[PDB]
Amino acid sequence: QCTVRYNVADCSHLKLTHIPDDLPSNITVLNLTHNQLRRLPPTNFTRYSQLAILDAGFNSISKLEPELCQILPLLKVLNLQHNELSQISDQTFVFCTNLTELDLMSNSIHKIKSNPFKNQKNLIKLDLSHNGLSSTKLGTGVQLENLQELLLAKNKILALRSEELEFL
């Protein structure tokens, strides 16, 4: 099974077909990286309500439900790089107000519409790379009050314009 070992559920290569929910729910760090994930269930995380951060990376997730942002209000790091994530919207980030770290290294998110990060105020680092972005625009209004580094690499942006960089 997983490692636990004082609140670091580092679940290595273990042929875990489904997301487990074991007795040691009193942990803060959980790692779903390198685990067979069909999708993140909006209700299977009720047992683990103390997860400060979750390392659910490189998995196979079609889309993210908004409920995941309210089942774990105390969420800091959301490392979900190398997933399918064909399309995403702001609705799934409504309740993620405490989010501080985002990692999306391969998701093929070609088009981004509206303001997906209208509720993210403590989000520091943005990792949106190799997702085939054609433009650097992320919205029309002013958001991202407190962020430090913006990662937009390996995408297909053709030019930078004043109208698409005025959202900050």
Ligand X SMILES: *[C@@H]1O[C@H](CO)[C@@H](O)[C@H](O)[C@H]1NC(C)=O
Q: Judged by CB under 7 A, does residue 31 bind RNA? A: no
Site string for RNA, 55-94 (x = CB under 7 A): ---xxx---------------------xxx----------
- Extract the tokens encoding 37: 């994930």
Q: Residue 154 in contact with residue 127, Cβ under 8 Å? A: no
Contacting residue, 7, 25, 28, 36, with RNA by CB under 7 A: 36
Task: Determine whether 4 is exposed, middle or buried from the number of CB atoms within 10 Å of its CB (0-12, 13-18, 19+).
Answer: middle
CB of 15 to RNA, least distance (A): 5
Binding residue (CB under 6 A) for ligand X from 2, 9, 11, 19: 19
8 A C-beta contact, residue 57 and residue 80: yes
Per rule CB under 7 A, is residue 106 in the interface with RNA? yes
d(CA 9, CA 3): 5
Which chain residues interact with ligand X by CB under 6 A? 18-19, 38-39, 41, 44
